[PDB]
Design a protein around this ligand. Structure first.
Ligand SMILES: [Zn+2]
Ligand SMILES: [Zn+2]
Ligand SMILES: [Zn+2]
Ligand SMILES: [Zn+2]
Lengths: 147, 279, 49, 56, 53, 53, 56, 44, 66, 49, 56
């Protein structure tokens, strides 16, 4: 206990003391960069992107989103981007096909892992495809908490 | 010089090699052999976390003014010196046009996408013998409508000339020449919600108006010559099919539209009131 | 066995803080480089030093 | 100051401590995730060969 | 799940319901059991149904 | 599945205990705190009667 | 000191340039190379110099 | 069943631009697809 | 919120007497001390659980989602 | 009497929007009449807080 | 850091249940109670450095 440390009952923690939720959110949306055609929320295939991550992109669906309720690890991907320029020699110039990604897909923060939940999508101020997700993660109290 | 660096494992050589990136350590390894290729990667996101060039062009814009640890006696000299190099570039006129189309689009409350697309439309040509002046406002009036339509947003000519009187035909010829310009360098359904917005109606009349407009576009009876008006009388017949007093004089004064054409469309759909209602 | 002294002991009200351990654990070796200075970059988010 | 007489480093750890009455002064308690994350170079001799081979 | 509660919340809530424990010697630990994934010798199965009526 | 109490309190059956010996301090393993009297500043055990003073 | 310090050098006539690493393009993550402060100011310098030389 | 959007307990089954503002409802926020797929949990 | 299960202090099954502890207030006009007496938790370790639980699930559920 | 007034409306609305977004307390003049902590992000941890 | 203290070396016994752990003795020269303060750690790379940390 010395110098304001604490002894605790892990059996009481088992019984259900001090359990806690943890919501986190994400902001993501598209842009027009032409020659007015905007980005897309596509599900990547193998030959889709430019400089693909190692995200193991299977957790997404055809709308380029993740269905809620499944579990995610730290490095996993949840959103998908694609570059809409138009005109920059769109999918046959200086790259393979792998058409026009330059993919800036947002992975989760690489430490915390949990359950995604209740993904909503709604147009922004000017009218675009604008996406927010929320992930739910239990954190049982551990040795290193400030009480 | 060929300006080229290609990465290849010196011990596998099966292809342009199947390689991966370990960004968490910033290194690259040929996945087959398991040997590094290079190290000390440069981040690709931290710069976007750190802090309109395509429309301002290669030359870069700079506004100058005052601060805290300065003197008013020379910041007024700076305020009268900030225009000593605006004549070196045509970008002073480019940004004057940008400012004026900003005036126009935000005056008509148009969004950022519409503003930037009009900026794009002006920057596209910005100088031809086809342009040839033409009041310098006809070009921006064409460009804002071009950017609006290519933003999949429809705005009326009546709105455009409520914004600027461009005598409606210099505007038209500017539209034609800008159309040819853009085709060289290479939709009225959304009018309906703005009309019902100005009229204040719920959804079902709007959906019915869209359905009837689709059906009348399919069948016959152009009958109004700019079918904007037969769309309008489709709303008129829908609201008379319901029981909300949106009488013809009120509609005409609201939409600045011809009531005789309203009665003509009323007669021609009075004939064809049959096949236009789903529930 | 019996305990020599005696203890003041009973119910009391506590509460929980925010600075949990998983946002503060952080370690790194031979990671990303900052292009201005060729040094390790900042931030627990992007795996700093 | 921020680049020459002080700068960022490598091989670094940063957590929060707790006491213990069973570890003497020259030791320190180190958590195993950090032990996985860090490293240390060695050399290959006739002496360390088998232990290094096993640990590889 | 549809409730206004979380799912692992419901799980930890469930985990404390005790059960009948007479014949507990008869069955076997899953760690020592030769099967995989909860044979009838080593575990039991629970079903719960509710409805918003 | 099976589980035991020692790794998690889910399988604990006990959830209470009571424990007493030498209710009357005869073994004198410990004294009592007092400010003016050992006796009156403390209550008797409920187990008092089964052993003599 | 004659070998290293002579006051005509103390007046600027010909100006060296800094290399690309000191003024690096940040590659601003959607379409820009993200040109920075030093290259920006040097471009200003070249513009003003060419203006003065044409004027004279 | 792909979208909900509203207080309706309706499997709206929207895919692409079929009056995204919900017809028998009055919403424009477009709730999305509580998952059919089976989940795993761990109640230890 | 929900009255929890298995007291941190003692650990017996708690919440059986929960809505009972309710209805020993309204239709009995009964003081809580003797209510907890006839309720019958002779320790205090469980008595505190119901003494300081505050319902939240009512205020939760009187939304109308979906 | 119409074309300028709507961009005036843009200026007034944009000015208030910029002010209550940033917390720089003044018009677009790079921190004149400048004092910062006027537009704090609302603390949203605990009802008491 | 203020003085010659705060700079100890240590040996290591590797511990699970991720956090640090150290002796209750050395606490006051470290000038830190357990109020949540964080520590900083470094690891030498070569033998000269390791030896001089060990011996000094
Ligand atoms: Zn290889
Ligand atoms: Zn089995
Ligand atoms: Zn709806
Ligand atoms: Zn209890």
């Amino acid at each position: 206990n010395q110098e304001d440390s604490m002894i605790m009952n892990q059996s009481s923690i088992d019984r259900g003391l001090f359990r806690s939720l943890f919501f986190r959110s994400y902001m993501d949306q598209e842009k027009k960069y032409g020659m007015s055609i905007t980005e897309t929320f596509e599900k990547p295939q193998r030959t889709n992107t430019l400089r693909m991550k190692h995200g193991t992109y299977d957790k997404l669906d055809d709308d380029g989103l993740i269905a809620p309720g499944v579990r995610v690890s730290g490095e996993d991907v949840i959103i998908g981007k694609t570059t809409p320029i138009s005109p920059d020699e769109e999918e046959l110039g200086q790259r393979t096909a792998y058409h026009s990604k330059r993919d800036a897909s947002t992975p989760l923060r690489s430490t915390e892992n949990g359950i995604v939940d209740q993904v909503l999508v709604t147009t922004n101020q000017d009218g675009l495809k604008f996406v927010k997700v929320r992930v739910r993660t239990t954190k049982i109290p551990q040795i290193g908490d400030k009480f | 010089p060929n300006l080229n660096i290609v990465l290849t494992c010196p011990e596998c050589k099966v292809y342009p090699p199947k390689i991966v990136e370990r960004f968490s350590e910033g290194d690259v390894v040929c996945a087959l052999c398991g040997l590094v290729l290079s190290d000390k990667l440069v981040d690709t996101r931290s710069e976007w976390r750190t802090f309109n060039p395509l429309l301002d062009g290669n030359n870069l814009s700079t506004r100058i003014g005052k601060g805290e640890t300065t003197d008013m006696r020379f910041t007024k000299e700076l305020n009268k010196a900030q225009g000593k190099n605006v004549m070196d570039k045509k970008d002073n006129e480019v940004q004057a046009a940008f400012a004026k189309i900003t005036m126009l689009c935000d005056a008509a409350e148009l969004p950022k996408i519409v503003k930037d697309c009009a900026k794009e439309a002006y920057k596209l040509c910005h100088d031809e013998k086809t342009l040839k002046g033409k009041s310098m406002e006809s070009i921006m009036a064409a460009s804002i409508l071009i950017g609006c339509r290519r933003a999949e947003v429809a705005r009326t000519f009546k709105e455009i000339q409520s914004l600027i009187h461009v005598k409606t035909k210099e505007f038209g010829k500017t539209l034609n020449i800008m159309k040819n310009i853009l085709r060289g360098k290479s939709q009225n359904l959304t009018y309906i919600p703005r009309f019902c917005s100005h009229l204040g109606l719920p959804m079902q009349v709007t959906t019915s108006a869209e359905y009837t407009a689709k059906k009348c576009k399919e069948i016959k009876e152009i009958a109004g010559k700019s079918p904007i008006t037969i769309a309008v009388v489709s709303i008129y017949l829908n609201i008379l099919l319901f029981q909300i007093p949106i009488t013809a004089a009120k509609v005409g004064q609201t939409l600045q539209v011809t009531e005789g054409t309203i009665k003509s469309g009323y007669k021609i759909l009075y004939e064809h009131r049959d096949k236009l209602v789903d529930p | 066995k019996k305990l020599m002294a005696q203890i003041f002991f009973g119910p009391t009200y506590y509460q929980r803080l925010r600075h949990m351990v998983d946002d503060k654990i952080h370690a790194r070796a031979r990671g990303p480089m900052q292009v201005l200075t060729r040094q390790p970059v900042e931030g627990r988010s992007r795996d700093g030093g | 100051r921020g680049n020459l007489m002080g700068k960022r480093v490598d091989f670094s750890a940063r957590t929060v401590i707790s006491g213990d009455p069973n570890l003497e002064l020259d030791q320190v308690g180190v958590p195993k995730s950090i032990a996985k994350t860090l490293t240390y170079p060695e050399v290959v001799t006739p002496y360390n060969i088998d232990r290094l081979t096993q640990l590889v | 799940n549809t409730t206004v509660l979380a799912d692992e919340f419901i799980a930890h809530r469930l985990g404390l319901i005790p059960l009948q424990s007479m014949d507990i010697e008869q069955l076997e630990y899953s760690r020592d059991c030769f099967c995989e994934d909860h044979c009838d010798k080593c575990s039991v199965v629970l079903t719960l149904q509710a409805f918003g009526e | 599945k099976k589980g035991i109490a020692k790794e998690h309190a889910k399988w604990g059956p006990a959830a209470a205990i009571e424990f007493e010996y030498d209710p009357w301090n005869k073994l004198k393993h410990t004294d009592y705190w007092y400010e003016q009297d050992s006796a009156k500043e403390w209550p008797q055990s409920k187990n008092c009667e089964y052993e003599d003073p | 000191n004659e070998v290293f310090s002579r006051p005509e050098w103390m007046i600027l006539t010909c100006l060296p340039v800094p290399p690309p690493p000191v003024r690096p393009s940040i590659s601003f993550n959607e379409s820009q190379r993200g040109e920075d402060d030093l290259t920006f100011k040097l471009a200003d310098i070249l513009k003003a110099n060419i203006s003065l030389e044409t004027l004279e | 069943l792909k979208y909900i959007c509203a207080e309706c307990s309706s499997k709206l089954s929207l895919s692409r631009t079929d009056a995204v503002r919900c017809k028998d409802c009055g919403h424009r926020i477009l709730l999305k697809a509580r998952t059919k797929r089976l989940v795993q949990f761990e109640a230890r | 919120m929900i009255v929890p299960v298995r007291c941190f202090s003692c650990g017996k099954v708690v919440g059986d007497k929960w809505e009972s502890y309710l209805n020993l207030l309204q239709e009995d006009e009964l003081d809580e001390g003797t209510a907890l007496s006839r309720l019958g938790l002779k320790r205090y370790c469980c008595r505190r659980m119901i003494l300081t639980h505050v319902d939240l699930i009512e205020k939760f559920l009187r939304y109308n989602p979906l | 009497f119409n074309m300028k007034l709507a961009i005036n409306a843009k200026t007034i609305t944009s000015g208030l929007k910029y002010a209550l977004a940033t917390g720089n307390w003044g018009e677009q003049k790079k921190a004149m009449s400048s004092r910062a902590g006027v537009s704090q992000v609302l603390n949203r941890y605990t009802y008491s807080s | 850091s203020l003085h010659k203290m705060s700079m100890m070396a240590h040996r290591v016994k590797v511990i699970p249940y991720s956090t640090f752990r150290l002796n209750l003795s050395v606490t006051s020269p470290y000038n830190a109670d357990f109020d949540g303060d964080e520590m900083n750690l470094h690891v030498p790379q070569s033998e000269e450095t390791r030896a001089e940390l060990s011996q000094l």
